[model samples]
Target: PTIHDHRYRCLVQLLTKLRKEASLSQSELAIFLGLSQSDISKIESFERRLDALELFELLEVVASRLGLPMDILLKDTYESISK
Candidate 1:
């Protein structure tokens, strides 16, 4: 339980930092990601499990919108994963 909680905190804190680093607002990310601000709040104060395909696609979308290389968002396997 302690490890799980720690993981959640680490990831959420990182997520929040990334948004700040990218100079984006919560509402902007929400609209761009097709998520509600509450949804982002969950992931930023929170966590989720995405199948590999979903994970790749979503992060790719975000990275593009963030004007960052996909590598900046995450390190992905060379294999394609998508919608």
Candidate 2:
């Protein structure tokens, strides 16, 4: 697969997992993220790419809402990005 395809897949998987783990419906997550439900669905479906800041913010929100460690939400991809 091309780099774009891989990235898209990775983002979709991560977002979907996070949403599920947080027990958030698309509309709930959209409300938390200050986006429309359609926007959340588009991102989760890989029809959109979230910028770094937005991704970080989303992860933080998910972690916070779920009472999970922020590092757990952020570690792998954030480490890869930093490398």
Candidate 3:
């Protein structure tokens, strides 16, 4: 796998963790994002990759949904990327 693939996998794992931590199902997250449940599943399963804008939007939605501060998500994501 390439670095890009690794990054995407990391992101997918992170998203999955976030969704689970928020007690959100894929369908719920899809509804929150105005997307199809399949899309959310695909993203969480690593079958689809998020662009920068999509990632930002997802993080925003997750933060709002979970009542988490955006900085927490940002910091975690950044730390993961740095590692």
- For all predictions, the C-alpha RMSD in Å is 6.4, 3.5, 2.7
Q: Which stretches of candidate 1 lie over 4 Å from their true place?
A: 1-4, 47-58, 76-83
Looking at model 3, the pairs that clash are none
lDDT of 1 by residue, 2-72 (tens): 22566445544655666676667877767766667776666665545323454455566567667879875
Report, for all candidates in order, the number of backbone clashes: 0, 0, 0
Compute the lDDT of residue 33 as modeled in candidate 2. 73
The TM-score, computed over Cα atoms with residue i paired to residue i, of candidate 3 is 0.81
Model 1 scores worst on lDDT over the 10 consecutive residues at: 74-83
**Largest TM-score belongs to which candidate?**
3
lDDT of 3 at 70: 94
User: Per-residue alpha-carbon lDDT of model 2 for 1-83, expressed as tens digits?
Assistant: 12357755666676688778878888987787788999877777767766667787788778887898988877855554322
* Reference-based TM-score of each model: 0.57, 0.76, 0.81
Clashing pairs in 2: none
